[PDB]
């Protein structure tokens, strides 16, 4: 919370100290774990969505050529999901090293689906955006995991 | 979130803009409603606890003199709870005016239990602290409600 507004508010109560301690406790600047935990939630969500949509596009039928490219993405994402899950376990264990390994793996995954899908004459934007989004997110996670305190 | 750390983090990703937009969205400085909403939650919680404990002290028996002072507090708090509930409805409706009225009412309530209980030779600290705490909290709410945009 803005140190400004916080003081602008407490400096009007019959007990600034209490008010300041309360607001600071309630709206504190995020810690590294929390930043990482949020980022992984977003990536896991995004990935899950992509996997549900890839399966969909495939289930409704598509030309032999696309169906192959997409089936590729499906396999890539199933791995990605798994890696992200493990990465979450590591973040929980405070293992930034382990987390970093895992997220990198997922990032590739996302990246690979993109490749396996670029040469298509037409692609579902949903899958492309999500894959790029997931790469951006994963990038953030990688940075954060590095700042996690090591052994 | 610290504009510093935020930049310290995004300035290491292959896409600062995205990362910055993400983190800023995810960990944004609280708005007035949110500050008020949190404060009321804390006060409502605190009040409810006090009421459950006042009833308790009374249910287990106490000398005629204390039982009267406490029964007083019970009535004061039952009103306080109600006022706080209404205040919550107002905050929801964006009625800072209405909210302010209601919280003031509760503040008194808290304050009154304190009076009705000071002349006792001995008091349950739990009830005293909670009442002072609730007054501090209510104070914050009063300030905030005033900054809520008016008609």
From Swiss-Prot, chains A, B:
Annotated glycan sites: 129
Keyword Glycoprotein: yes
Recorded GO CC terms: apoplast; pollen tube tip
Keyword terms of this UniProt record: Apoplast, Disulfide bond, Glycoprotein, Secreted, Signal
GO terms of biological process kind: pollen tube growth
Major localization class: secreted
Tissues showing expression: Highest expression in flowers. Expressed exclusively at the pollen tube tip.
Top-level lineage group: Eukaryota
Disulfide bonds: 10-19, 73-113
Domain free text: The N-terminal alpha-hairpin extension is required for pectinmethylesterase inhibitor activity.
Quaternary structure annotation from Swiss-Prot or TrEMBL: Monomer and homodimer. Interacts in vitro with PPME1.
Functional summary from the UniProt entry: Inhibits pectin methylesterase (PME) from flowers and siliques. Inhibits PME from leaves.
Protein name: Pectinesterase inhibitor 1
Species: Arabidopsis thaliana (Mouse-ear cress)
